[PDB]
């Protein structure tokens, strides 16, 4: 989740088409909490939204 936070700023100040490529690479990062909660028989979209909600800065 934090790598997705680490890359959206890295997308934002990049410039051109590469910005959208950094962001969709961060969309591939989100599947790892997603496959676990389904395997743990829980909600994936809830749990990953909990993760990013715990934050001060991206570390």
């Amino acid at each position: 989740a934090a790598l997705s936070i680490y890359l959206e700023n890295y997308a934002t100040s990049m410039g051109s088409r590469e910005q959208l490529a950094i962001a969709e690479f961060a969309r591939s990062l989100l599947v790892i909490p997603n496959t676990l909660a389904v395997n743990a028989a829980q909600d994936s979209t809830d749990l990953v939204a909990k993760l990013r909600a715990f934050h001060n800065e991206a570390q």
């Binding site: 936070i5 959206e8 979209t45 809830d46 909990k50 990013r52 934050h55």
Partner: protein, 73 residues
């Protein structure tokens, strides 16, 4: 045909200036605010969600489509 576009050139200045008088509270045009508001509200998608980053992210996804279309038209 030059005067057809010239009339609608003048008509745009009539529409925007009458609108500028009735509301002094004026921002920039061209969807310039929306791209900021796209990134502004995805920060709330970073901030708030229990599940709401799917919605506010989609909300902020649709905001940049207007200057996207204004580039695409």
């Amino acid at each position: 045909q030059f005067m057809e576009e010239t009339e609608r050139s003048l008509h745009d200045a009539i529409m925007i200036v009458r609108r500028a008088i009735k509301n002094d509270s004026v921002v920039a045009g061209g969807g310039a605010i929306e791209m900021e508001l796209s990134k502004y509200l995805r920060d709330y998608s970073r901030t708030i969600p229990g599940k709401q980053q799917l919605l506010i992210g989609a909300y902020a996804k649709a905001l940049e489509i207007i200057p996207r279309q204004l580039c695409d038209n």
